[PDB]
Write an enzyme that holds these catalytic residues in place. Structure first.
Site, PDB file in Angstrom:
ATOM      1  N   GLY G  29     -30.327  78.795  98.024  1.00  0.00           N
ATOM      2  CA  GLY G  29     -29.047  78.363  97.508  1.00  0.00           C
ATOM      3  C   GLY G  29     -28.091  77.416  98.300  1.00  0.00           C
ATOM      4  CB  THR G  30     -25.228  75.398  97.246  1.00  0.00           C
ATOM      5  OG1 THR G  30     -24.438  76.648  96.814  1.00  0.00           O
ATOM      6  CG2 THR G  30     -26.004  75.329  96.144  1.00  0.00           C
TER       7      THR G  30
END
Ligand SMILES: Nc1ncnc2c1ncn2[C@@H]1O[C@H](COP(=O)(O)OP(=O)(O)OP(=O)(O)O)[C@@H](O)[C@H]1O
Ligand SMILES: Nc1ncnc2c1ncn2[C@@H]1O[C@H](COP(=O)(O)OP(=O)(O)OP(=O)(O)O)[C@@H](O)[C@H]1O
Ligand SMILES: Nc1ncnc2c1ncn2[C@@H]1O[C@H](COP(=O)(O)OP(=O)(O)O)[C@@H](O)[C@H]1O
Lengths: 264, 250, 273, 238, 276, 239, 243
Positions: G29-30
């Site tokens: 994820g980010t």
């Protein structure tokens, strides 16, 4: 062909190459002094020798290295034979090969034999394999004589089996070796800084500082790790800040697959 | 917060042989030795407190327990599957009987009210059995002394004498010599200890193993006075010293 | 190979060494005796001189010891496989020997065979797990009942045997492929009586002897126990230097059976009444 | 093993084990004359120290006209009696008359398949003997099993070789076979099927029904050790 | 005949143990020679009494306890033939090596008239009865039955009756042991031997040495866990200490730690971890 | 069998012997003793990164103005036990009018662990505990728990991966002076014995932050801060 | 092997590997961080674009739970939002009680045991998210991070996503450079540096930034996103640190 095992002996090599926890190093040597150099003592008392022994130490702590050094002390033939390596679905192939092992062994004494990962050693299949565990233990001290040929089981899973350890008169010197302290970690660099250049100072204070859980193999790998990118300096000595650029990540793979180590 | 294991944890065999209790009665043997004998003068029990470390008390651990002023009990096997069971019996002797007929009950009617939960630990869903088989002592003015052994299946033996655990059968091989009918209580401790001396490898001192008995009326325990009518607590446990006073006296 | 074959060196047993067994000889000799003793007699009707028979029963019996004596008083041959030796660590060795087997008896009509154990050829099932042994049970049964077996069943009767019965292939038995079976049970007490008369023939003008006074007591299964207790009874006399023997010295020998008659420990599990 | 579902060809996986399992259990028979009733059971154990004297295990009662016997678990049967007992006296505070059996079992054993039918719970490792009397069908006798199907009979066994033992009643039983002429069949029905032919009054347990009291009353008589001990001599054991 | 799977053991290459290397054990050592050593000689008496020679034994008890110590001092005093074997060679990787050999095994004995054999252990072979689940196991039971008929199937007297060593004696596939197939079965206990511990604890001390500044037979008084194979194993270790310090013969303070230097591990959470 | 809390084939519980070993994820050792009229409890406090706020890190909690406890396990598993303590003190005194003892409250939470071994909706907890308190009826005392229910007092004890390194070292001490607890009054002047014993027996030297402390003072429980520890560390100025 | 199939099945190692697989989900994820300034906290996050069709500045990933809080996450978008909807009512059921705002230790003491409850049972999914929160109480400044095994510790800074290795050593390179105290406005510059500095693990793609802080000083310790030139002041700056 088990030459592939029994052919790592001829070149004489020092017993000095490992300091370790010396009192254990004092144990196995002094107790194996006896057959070779001062066998008079067993006669003056009239007591049987140590009918083989074992040990324990967790992985990667010079165990096989320890064993591989002793045979060169006196002129045995140090074999190499993994427990799991001798593992075949064929039933008798288990118990047949072992008999041929002792066969060539007693064909050549005074020599030496070795095992490491034997810790693996009502259901249908299992009712035959215990016989192997029941066979070989018999083949130690069941009927036959054994002149000048011995054995060590050197595992990393000391919950092996009750019965082989249940009656520790068959085997003895069921020793342990734990991992180093600074007491140990420090002097190990002396051999590992032996054949390499270096500046000269009490640089190893970081050694006792960190490395509380590594073993001997990786610190050796840490030595060469520092020397690789120490050539960018390219100097005619080596600095202890050099290694520091990789001591981290080696622990991060020492981090990888955390496994415990109890002694028994 | 969701329950879906409501099936039975229990399994038939081809030939009866209900599985996961027949495995249970290993641990009952793996546990310590403990016993119980009667006589018309009184009743006795005993065990052996296997203090693990040299650090732990034995005061904190109740390897013997009180049920009512006229009952005791003891186990072998597992402990935490024993401690809970006391209170779920204490709370039952009142919430079914004792607050409803005044008097405390006879001994067996209680036993109907422990197997009637021990059973539910199996035929119900989402559960296991208590890995315990324990022992009760008896008294009542209408039926007399008795022992009553229980077991996780839900049965309950009666007895005149028995024992359990890691040294059971040897005792059952022994005590069928020692027992008889012409019995007081003061004798019964010699055989009970003399039994429980042979089946041990460790220390054998009074401050190591607890036991208890069923004496007679002892109003000194009762706390108050004035009513000559009341029958005091026949149940009683012994001290450190009174054990050793027997032991020296061998 | 002819090692399996019958013998010019017959054993020396007899079917009157065999007390207690009284009725079975009448029930089983005739298929092995009579119509082969008189095929014209049987052929007067000629129903079917059947194929072999079978005997089931526990150990302790001497089903073997029966089968040793029948090879005496024969008029015929009595071959032996030394059970399960026929198989080897290969495939082709199976059927050839069975092919060799029948023909070895075709040349001898008045001649028969012996098995002891068919626990090792029983209850064939296969989904990848099995063995070549199942292959051989077919062809023998095939050459038992085929274009070439009834000519043996013209010439032959046979027998099988074991000690555990219902653990084999029912597809074996077409009753008629085996036309009769029988139980060799454990004995009666009084059946046990005449047994020890056989083997203890060693008393020396002694007296106070009550041979009935031992099957008085027994609840066993074997008859061989009559020997196991007898054989070690004399051991007492053997050690104490006096060849003679009596009842009581002979009686406590059951103390050896005090283990056997009481080795079966019992469970206390009153789970169910 | 998913108690609900059937076999691939119309059978069950569990329950055929259960009424086959109970065969491991003891013996409990039960018969009837046109005069009276007899019952019997051989305790699974007859060791000596324990309290076989007052050991009331195989034979319980329910009210003052009924008696039963037991075969199966000590406990999973031990609850049904406390259940069914209530369904007896709870018949009475509605109606005040005595209870008949033919309502009881038909209104009892339907509980059984209720645990075969759903819940994933096991059935009951139990079978019964029955006995009693109503004023409308005379003396009676019934049985059961973990399924629920109940069968009226004149004489029955359970447990060890009950199929074998039921033969032993086949030839000897008589229509007008009186009580003292029929009682001896029972322990003789057991005097053969026993494992320990060495027999002890201790090992078994006993019960009776008669109509002994005049004015048509009855007796749920149950028999103590030294009585049946002396009864045992009557047929001539020792 | 060669039959190169087991050779005549003890022609000139043999062990060297004695009868008297044992301590007591005469509660069993008497009977065995009461059916072994004498039938070499007084066979005529067995013809005077006993329709056959009582022979065939099953020696048992817990293992690593004393069984195999006794098996072979007799080997030193046979004046006759003798054979050893690994008691699970019969489990060959392929099939048939046993049934081809076991028939050739007794072929060695019948020519070697008379003789004796023995076995290491048969814990894997004891199997009363299975339903045929796979050939993976059924090559066991077929060997066992073949062993039996090879024992008293037909050949009766000229053969030798034999032993049965083990590590347990309740799993044994019955119909093997019989009043005729064996006619004998013996063992020896493990519980405390006040009569035997009192002497076996220093029967080897004659084989050993000791210079008593005090009395060293007092650990025998300390009865908790009297065993049979440790009780010589200890001094098999305790003697390695005076030598470890150049001391010429041990002292009694040297061994009491050597007793506990074999730590009895009475405290181990592996016991505490399971039930609770 | 090797996934749930049924009884094993032989009769142990493989899902539970694991849980003891689920504690040892941290390489952490703690210790427990009895004072004269006080008590002491301590443990390592590791900080292998630079950015934490060790103001925040803690295993040693505060449940009354009376008692305390410690943990050597995963703290998320701890907090569910931590919270359930604060509750189960209140409901006691609200029903009886006096504070929560230790001997009882372990006997509660020891009853609680059993019905996590007797059902299967629940995950047990891979922790253990050492409760500490004074008692107006029983005096200085502690109690330990396992995840099964075995709870027992200890005159003095410790825990972690390295019990063998010290637990022998303590039993050697009482075989040198032979009484239950120490013959020294002030809590300030007995914590020295603890930290004197750790580094010496088999432990490693410590610094200011490396350790944390709790004391069950008469009618008071509370932690300690930096200089409060550094001062108490400088007792070693004399020894 | 065979123990790695469901919740609440410990290992011989003494673990449940399933949540340790969750760590690789949140690893996927980010980037996202949040810093303990001298007087409050900061929030900043990575927000990558796939196509131009995605609108800018209508799709925030920060969430608010109440006035004096900001919270973010990384990894599973929904799952990290659920417990916020639990958060937004819990403290609301606590200001209900003594009529005062909620502490931050009250937050995790009312959350950090929640997700634990989704690792007790064989019937639910562990919240495969790592999570941040911060804000102010009467006491002063606070900051925390969560990991899906319930754990949480008070940091001075944190990081998640595949922006781990950059920032962690970087903050090690920051703190010694500036331990004296870092006020609110200044970290808003230095924060957005790091995200431009940490995208290099995924500089195949593009994004746009999103920031929020809360100061006891500036905004009365209330929560207030960024929207203005101040953001544009920082991106003009943060390019230079990578320049
Ligand atoms: N009535 C009898 N007459 C003669 N011998 C008997 C009699 N009863 C038992 N025996 C003895 O029984 C022994 C063999 O019987 P048993 O059935 O126990 O084994 P077996 O028949 O040899 O085994 P298997 O049939 O499996 O090969 C012989 O030694 C024999 O002497
Ligand atoms: N009386 C004794 N004299 C000499 N050695 C003994 C004596 N008792 C036990 N031992 C020793 O104990 C060791 C183990 O015992 P032993 O092997 O006899 O047990 P076992 O039952 O034969 O086990 P296994 O059958 O598996 O070999 C032997 O090496 C033996 O030397
Ligand atoms: N006690 C020690 N002192 C110095 N070096 C050691 C020690 N133990 C291990 N090492 C190093 O670690 C390595 C161990 O490798 P090896 O012996 O192959 O594995 P194992 O330890 O399992 O036998 C060796 O290269 C050795 O140099």
């Amino acid at each position: 062909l088990v030459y592939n095992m029994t052919s790592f002996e001829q070149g004489e090599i020092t017993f000095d190459g490992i300091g370790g926890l010396t009192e254990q190093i004092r144990e196995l040597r002094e107790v194996i002094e006896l057959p070779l150099k001062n066998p008079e003592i067993f006669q003056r008392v009239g007591i049987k020798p140590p009918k083989g022994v074992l040990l324990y130490g967790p992985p990667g702590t010079g165990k096989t290295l320890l064993a591989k050094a002793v045979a060169a002390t006196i002129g045995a033939n140090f074999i190499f034979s993994p427990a799991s390596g001798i593992v075949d679905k064929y039933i008798g192939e288990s118990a047949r090969i072992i008999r041929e092992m002792f066969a060539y062994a007693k064909e050549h004494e005074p020599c030496i034999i070795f095992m490491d990962e034997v810790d693996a050693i009502g259901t249908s299949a299992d009712r035959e394999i215990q016989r192997t565990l029941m066979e070989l233990l018999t083949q130690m001290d069941g009927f036959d004589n054994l002149g000048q040929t011995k054995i060590i089981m050197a595992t990393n899973r000391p919950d092996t089996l009750d019965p082989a350890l249940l009656r520790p008169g068959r085997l003895d010197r069921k020793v342990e070796i734990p991992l180093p302290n600074e007491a140990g970690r420090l002097e190990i660099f002396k051999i590992h800084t032996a054949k390499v250049k270096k500046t000269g100072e009490f640089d190893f204070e970081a050694a006792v500082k960190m490395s509380d859980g590594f073993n001997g193999a990786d610190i050796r790998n840490c030595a060469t790790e520092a020397g690789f990118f120490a050539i960018r300096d390219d100097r005619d000595h080596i600095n202890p800040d050099d290694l520091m650029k990789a001591v981290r990540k080696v622990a991060e793979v020492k981090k990888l697959e955390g496994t415990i180590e109890y002694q028994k | 917060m969701t329950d879906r294991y409501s099936f039975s944890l229990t399994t038939f065999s081809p030939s009866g042989k209900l599985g996961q209790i027949d495995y249970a009665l290993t641990a009952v043997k793996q546990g310590v030795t403990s016993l119980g004998i009667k006589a018309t003068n009184g009743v006795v029990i005993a065990t052996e407190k296997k203090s693990s470390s040299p650090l732990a008390m034995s005061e904190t651990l109740s390897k013997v327990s009180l049920l009512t002023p006229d009952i005791g009990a003891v186990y072998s096997g597992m402990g935490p599957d024993y401690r809970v069971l006391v209170d779920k019996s204490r709370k039952v002797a009142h919430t079914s009987y004792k607050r409803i007929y005044g008097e405390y009950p006879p001994t067996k009617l209680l036993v109907s009210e422990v197997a009637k939960i021990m059973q539910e630990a199996t035929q119900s869903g989402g559960v296991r059995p208590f890995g315990v088989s324990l022992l009760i002592a008896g008294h009542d003015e209408f039926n007399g002394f008795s022992l009553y052994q229980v077991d996780p299946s839900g049965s309950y033996f009666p007895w005149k004498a028995t024992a359990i655990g890691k040294g059971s059968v040897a005792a059952k091989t022994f005590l069928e010599k020692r027992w008889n009918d012409e019995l007081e209580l003061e004798d019964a401790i010699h055989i009970a200890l003399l039994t429980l001396k042979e089946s041990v490898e460790g220390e054998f001192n009074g401050d190591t193993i607890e036991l208890a008995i069923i004496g007679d009326e002892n109003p000194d325990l009762l706390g108050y006075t004035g009513i000559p009518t009341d029958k005091g607590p026949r149940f009683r446990k012994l001290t450190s010293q009174e054990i050793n006073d027997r032991l020296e006296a061998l | 190979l002819v090692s399996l074959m019958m013998v010019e060196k017959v054993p020396d047993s007899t079917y009157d060494m065999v007390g207690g067994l009284t009725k079975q000889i009448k029930e089983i000799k005739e298929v092995i005796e009579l119509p082969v003793k008189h095929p014209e007699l049987f052929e007067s009707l000629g129903i079917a001189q059947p194929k072999g028979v079978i005997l089931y029963g526990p150990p302790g019996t001497g089903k073997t010891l029966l089968a040793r004596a029948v090879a005496h008083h024969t008029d015929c041959k009595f071959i032996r496989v030394s059970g399960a030796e026929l198989v080897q660590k290969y495939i082709g060795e199976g059927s050839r020997m069975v092919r060799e087997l029948f023909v070895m008896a075709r040349e001898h009509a008045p001649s028969i065979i012996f098995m002891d154990e068919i626990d090792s050829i029983g209850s064939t099932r296969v989904e990848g797990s099995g063995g070549g042994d199942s292959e051989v049970q077919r062809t023998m049964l095939e050459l038992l009942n085929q274009l070439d077996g009834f000519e043996t069943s013209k010439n032959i009767k046979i027998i099988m045997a074991t000690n555990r019965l219902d653990i084999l292939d029912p597809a074996l038995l077409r009753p008629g492929r085996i036309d009769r079976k029988i139980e060799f049970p454990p004995p009666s007490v009084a059946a046990r009586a005449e047994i020890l008369r056989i083997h203890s023939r060693k008393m020396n003008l002694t007296r106070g002897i009550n041979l009935r006074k031992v099957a008085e007591k027994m609840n066993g299964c074997s008859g061989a126990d009559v020997k196991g207790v007898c054989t070690e009874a004399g051991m007492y006399a053997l050690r104490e230097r006096r060849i003679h023997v009596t009842q009581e010295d002979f009686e406590l020998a059951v103390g050896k059976v005090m283990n056997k008659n009481q080795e079966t420990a019992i469970s206390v599990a009153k789970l169910f009444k | 093993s998913r108690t609900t579902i059937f076999s691939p060809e119309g059978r069950l996986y569990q329950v055929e084990y259960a009424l086959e399992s109970i065969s491991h259990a003891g013996t409990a028979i039960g018969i009837m004359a046109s005069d009276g009733i007899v019952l019997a059971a051989e305790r699974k154990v007859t060791s000596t120290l324990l309290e076989q004297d007052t050991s009331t295990e195989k034979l319980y009662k329910l009210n003052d006209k009924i008696a039963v016997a037991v075969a199966g678990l000590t406990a999973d049967a031990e609850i049904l009696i406390n259940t069914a007992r209530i369904h007896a006296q709870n018949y009475l505070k509605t109606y005040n008359e005595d209870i008949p059996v033919e309502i009881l079992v038909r209104r009892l054993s339907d509980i059984k398949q209720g645990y075969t039918q759903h819940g994933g719970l096991r059935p009951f490792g139990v079978s019964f003997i029955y006995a009693g009397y109503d004023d409308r069908y005379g003396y009676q006798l019934y049985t059961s099993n973990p399924s629920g199907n109940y069968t009226g009979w004149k004489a029955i066994s359970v447990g060890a070789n009950t199929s074998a033992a039921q033969t032993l009643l086949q030839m000897d039983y008589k229509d007008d076979m009186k009580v003292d002429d029929a009682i001896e069949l029972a322990l003789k029905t057991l005097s053969k099927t026993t494992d320990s032919s060495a027999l002890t009054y201790d090992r078994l347990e006993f019960a009776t029904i008669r109509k002994g009291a005049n004015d048509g009353e009855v007796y749920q008589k149950i028999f103590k050790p030294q009585e049946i001990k002396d009864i045992l001599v009557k047929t001539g054991i020792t | 005949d060669s039959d190169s799977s087991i050779s005549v053991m003890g022609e000139n290459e043999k062990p060297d143990v004695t009868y008297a290397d044992v301590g007591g054990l005469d509660m069993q050592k008497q009977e065995i020679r009461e059916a072994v050593e004498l039938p070499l000689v007084q066979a005529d008496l067995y013809e005077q009494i006993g329709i056959d020679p009582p022979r065939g034994v099953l020696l048992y008890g817990p293992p690593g306890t004393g069984k195999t110590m006794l098996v072979k001092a007799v080997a030193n005093s046979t004046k006759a033939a003798f054979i050893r074997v690994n008691g699970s060679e019969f489990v060959h990787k392929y099939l048939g090596e046993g049934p081809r050999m076991v028939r050739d095994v007794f072929r060695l004995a019948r020519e070697n008239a008379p003789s004796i054999i023995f076995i290491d252990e048969v814990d894997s072979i004891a199997t009363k009865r299975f339903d045929a689940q796979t050939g993976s196991d059924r090559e066991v039971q077929r060997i066992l039955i073949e062993l039996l008929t090879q024992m008293d199937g037909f050949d009766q007297s000229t053969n030798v009756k034999v032993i049965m060593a083990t590590n347990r004696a309740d799993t044994l596939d019955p119909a093997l042991l019989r009043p005729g197939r064996l006619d004998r079965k013996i063992e020896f206990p493990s519980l405390r031997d006040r009569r035997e511990r009192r002497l076996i604890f220093g029967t080897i001390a004659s084989k050993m040495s000791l210079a008593p500044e005090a009395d060293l037979d007092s650990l025998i008084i300390r009865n908790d866990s009297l065993s049979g194979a440790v009780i010589a194993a200890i001094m098999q270790e305790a003697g390695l200490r005076a030598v470890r310090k150049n001391r010429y013969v041990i002292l009694q303070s040297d061994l009491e730690e050597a007793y506990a230097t074999q730590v009895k591990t009475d405290n181990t959470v592996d016991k505490f971890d399971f039930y609770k | 069998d090797r996934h749930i809390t049924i009884f094993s084939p032989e009769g142990r519980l493989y899902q539970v012997e694991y849980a003891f070993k689920a504690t040892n994820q941290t390489n952490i050792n703690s210790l427990a003793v009895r004072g004269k009229d006080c008590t002491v409890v301590i443990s390592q406090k590791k900080v292998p990164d630079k950015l934490l706020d060790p103001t925040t890190v803690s295993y040693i909690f505060c449940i009354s103005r009376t008692i305390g406890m410690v943990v050597n396990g995963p703290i998320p598993d701890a907090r569910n036990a931590a919270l359930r303590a604060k509750a189960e003190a209140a409901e006691f005194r609200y029903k009886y009018g006096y504070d929560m003892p230790c001997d009882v409250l372990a006997k509660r939470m020891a009853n609680l662990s059993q019905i996590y071994t007797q059902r299967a909706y629940m995950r047990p907890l891979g922790v253990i505990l050492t409760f500490v308190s004074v008692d107006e009826e029983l005096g200085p005392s502690i109690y330990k728990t396992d995840p099964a229910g075995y709870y027992v007092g200890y005159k003095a004890t410790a825990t972690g991966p390295k019990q063998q390194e010290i637990t022998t070292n303590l039993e050697n001490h009482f075989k040198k002076s032979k009484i239950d607890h120490i013959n020294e009054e002030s809590w300030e002047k007995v914590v020295e014995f603890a930290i004197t014993h750790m580094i010496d027996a088999l432990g490693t030297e410590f610094s200011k932050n490396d350790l944390e402390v709790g004391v069950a003072t008469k009618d008071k429980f509370f932690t300690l801060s930096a200089e409060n520890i550094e001062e108490r560390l400088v007792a070693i100025a004399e020894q | 092997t065979g123990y790695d199939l469901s919740n609440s099945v410990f290992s011989p190692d003494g673990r449940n590997f399933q949540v340790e697989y969750a760590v690789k989900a949140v690893e996927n994820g980010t980037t996202s961080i949040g810093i303990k300034c001298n007087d409050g906290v900061v929030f900043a996050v990575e927000k990558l674009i796939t196509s131009k069709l995605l609108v800018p500045q209508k799709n925030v990933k920060i969430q608010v739970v109440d006035r004096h809080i900001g919270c973010v996450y990384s990894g599973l978008i929904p799952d990290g939002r659920h417990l916020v909807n639990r958060g937004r009512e819990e403290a609301a059921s606590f200001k209900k009680l003594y009529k005062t705002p909620i502490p931050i230790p009250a937050f995790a003491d009312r959350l950090g045991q929640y997700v634990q409850a989704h690792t007790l049972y064989n019937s639910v999914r562990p919240f495969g998210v790592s999570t941040i929160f911060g804000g102010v109480d009467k006491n002063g400044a606070h900051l925390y991070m969560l990991e899906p095994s319930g754990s949480y510790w008070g940091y001075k800074g944190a990081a998640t996503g595949k922006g781990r290795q950059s920032a962690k050593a970087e903050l090690e390179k920051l703190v010694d450079h500036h331990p004296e105290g870092l006020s609110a406005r200044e970290a808003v510059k230095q924060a957005a540096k790091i995200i431009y500095l940490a995208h290099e693990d995924n500089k195949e793609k593009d994004f746009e930034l999103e920031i929020s802080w809360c100061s006891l000083s500036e905004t009365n310790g209330l929560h207030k996103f960024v929207k203005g030139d101040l953001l544009q002041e920082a991106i003009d700056f943060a390019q230079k640190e990578i320049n």
